[PDB]
Amino acid sequence: SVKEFLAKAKEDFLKKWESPAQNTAHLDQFERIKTLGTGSFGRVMLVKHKETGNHYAMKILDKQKVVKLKQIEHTLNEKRILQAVNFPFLVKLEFSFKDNSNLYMVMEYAPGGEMFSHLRRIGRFSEPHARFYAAQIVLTFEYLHSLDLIYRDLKPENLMIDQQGYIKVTDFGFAKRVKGRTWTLCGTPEYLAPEIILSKGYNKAVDWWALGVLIYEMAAGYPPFFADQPIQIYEKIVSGKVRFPSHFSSDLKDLLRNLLQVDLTKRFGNLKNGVNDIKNHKWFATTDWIAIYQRKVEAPFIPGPGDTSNFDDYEEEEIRVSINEKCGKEFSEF
Amino acid sequence: TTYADFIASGRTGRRNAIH
Ligand SMILES: Cc1ccc(C[C@H](N)CNc2nnc(-c3ccc4[nH]ncc4c3)s2)cc1
């Protein structure tokens, strides 16, 4: 049973958490082909293995920058979580290594691109299209939460689309192992639950709120709470007033009202029946949960190898490796 | 329109996590 499934998932997770591999490869084994994304977080590049010819998404982190930004713990934790989890909609870490100046996480490449760009390009997704993605997130959170892992950064920008049109969740720098409450202020403005913003001790239910935000944006083409800057966004979020596009179905609106619920005693995913209130909701009546997990549902939309047509362009910058080792002790466990 | 207001907000591009 699904319960029985989660059972084994936990054992395998605890098992892999103890044991994390280090330097399973080296930079000389990869040919950089294109920078797929860059920013404060660092940068991800499409690379091609010089021996097999296979492609991967390599995330490069500048050690001195990570320290400067005080993300040492987060960086070590994402690697640790990544190699310890296993679910069809969670991206996998295939190689990791470091040199004098940088840290490298070589992960599965998602040819389809960022869900973000497709959403902005197309405008909005039809309810069935939105439902197909939503279903994947529900299962992923069911899985993560059973391991006491809170994702804490759900958004179109972190959801990649693979060759079959399914989702690959990326970026676990904010994910945290927590049984009850936690207190760190983190996440993305538009997707923050009210309790996070109010500096209260919160729980995994913030991911469910985020799901509501995600479904709304996918279906409307824009987030439920927006403003010129974070401060104003927070005001609207805590006020909890949401208005739905007229094209939103009665079932979709009901689901969203229960997901975007400030009252934690009433928010779906946080009640006695757990994720079942979501999975059994009218809007998901036609959803075949088992078929989704098994990837037997033909994706509503499906964007040679090494192709990067689905990603945006960024200026290619050097991969400088210093002569002196930098921040050796800080990243000794990486 | 609500959509118009969204654009006017100016946060239509990729959003960063808060730091
Ligand atoms: C291109 C991109 C995607 C997401 C973002 C936003 C994100 N918060 C930044 N951090 C990230 N961590 N792991 C990332 C990752 C892992 C495996 C992958 N396979 N294919 C693509 C891809 C991306 S990205 C920026 C750029």
Side-chain angles (χ1 to χ4, degrees), chain A residues 230-240 242-257:
Chain A
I231 304 292
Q232 290 61 67
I233 297 178
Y234 303 149
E235 285 185 56
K236 292 180 177 188
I237 288 174
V238 305
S239 110
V242 186
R243 122 192 270 89
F244 304 103
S246 68
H247 62 74
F248 270 31
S249 68
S250 56
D251 289 323
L252 175 53
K253 290 184 300 190
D254 184 75
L255 205 217
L256 294 175
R257 271 189 282 266

Side-chain angles (χ1 to χ4, degrees), chain A residues 35-39 41-44 56-59 78 82 91-92 105-111 113-114 151 153 155-161 168-172 311 314, chain B residues 14-17:
Chain A
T35 292
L36 304 179
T38 192
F41 75 81
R43 49 182 174 153
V44 186
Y56 305 90
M58 182 175 85
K59 184 180 191 176
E78 163 174 52
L82 269 176
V91 72
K92 292 182 159 54
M105 291 177 202
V106 185
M107 307 167 264
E108 299 179 296
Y109 171 52
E114 297 154 287
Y151 181 57
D153 198 30
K155 56 180 170 177
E157 294 97 312
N158 292 349
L159 307 182
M160 302 305 94
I161 308 305
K168 289 302 189 195
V169 177
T170 68
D171 204 326
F172 301 82
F311 296 87
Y314 302 89
Chain B
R14 300 184 173 74
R15 300 153 293 204
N16 286 170

Side-chain angles (χ1 to χ4, degrees), chain A residues 38-66:
Chain A
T38 192
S40 166
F41 75 81
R43 49 182 174 153
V44 186
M45 310 194 81
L46 172 63
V47 294
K48 181 181 195 171
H49 200 94
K50 298 182 185 178
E51 304 167 22
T52 60
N54 281 335
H55 295 275
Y56 305 90
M58 182 175 85
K59 184 180 191 176
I60 308 169
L61 303 184
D62 181 297
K63 290 189 289 187
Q64 292 182 298
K65 293 186 184 188
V66 174

Side-chain angles (χ1 to χ4, degrees), chain A residues 214-231:
Chain A
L214 185 74
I215 300 179
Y216 182 112
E217 199 176 328
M218 291 193 295
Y222 53 83
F225 309 107
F226 59 80
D228 315 340
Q229 33 215 196
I231 304 292

Side-chain angles (χ1 to χ4, degrees), chain A residues 115 119 130 133-134 137 154-157 159 167 191 209-220 222 224 256 260:
Chain A
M115 178 196 285
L119 183 53
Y133 292 150
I137 304 300
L154 185 59
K155 56 180 170 177
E157 294 97 312
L159 307 182
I167 293 170
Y191 284 72
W209 165 282
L211 174 65
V213 179
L214 185 74
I215 300 179
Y216 182 112
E217 199 176 328
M218 291 193 295
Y222 53 83
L256 294 175
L260 298 177

Side-chain angles (χ1 to χ4, degrees), chain A residues 61-72 99-103 321-322 324-328 330-331:
Chain A
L61 303 184
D62 181 297
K63 290 189 289 187
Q64 292 182 298
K65 293 186 184 188
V66 174
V67 180
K68 184 148 305 203
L69 311 189
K70 299 183 175 184
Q71 299 188 324
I72 299 178
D99 51 33
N100 283 176
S101 312
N102 312 301
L103 303 171
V321 182
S322 177
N324 303 295
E325 174 172 56
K326 308 286 193 54
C327 313
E330 302 88 312
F331 300 104

